[PDB]
């Protein structure tokens, strides 16, 4: 039980350290894609543009 | 120690989708990091 008692605190440990890894690891896309949607528009407003402009 | 051995299982099975949940969340931000490139050499091409 020494041996376990430890090991029991080393897992509870890590996976306390998992999840608030996932949380910053989300926490960067949502940053990420919200300005991705702020470009993305800029793509297909000059797609429009230039192909109207082409003949 | 037996139930004692019954927690060291149900953790290490719940850590094992614990980095999973974090791994998988690591995809998306890999795919916005892909997909702003085919948008910005979208915009170049557009900008001149």
């Given at each position: 039980?020494?041996?376990?008692?430890?090991?029991?605190?080393?897992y509870?440990?890590?996976?306390?350290?998992?999840?608030?890894?996932?949380?910053?690891?989300?926490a960067?896309?949502?940053k990420?894609?919200q300005?991705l949607?702020?470009?993305?528009?800029?793509?297909?407003?000059?797609?429009?543009?230039?192909?109207k402009?082409?003949?």
């Amino acid at each position: 039980v020494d041996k376990l008692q430890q090991k029991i605190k080393t897992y509870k440990r890590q996976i306390e350290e998992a999840e608030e890894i996932a949380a910053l690891n989300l926490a960067k896309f949502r940053k990420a894609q919200q300005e991705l949607e702020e470009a993305e528009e800029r793509a297909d407003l000059a797609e429009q543009a230039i192909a109207k402009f082409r003949t």
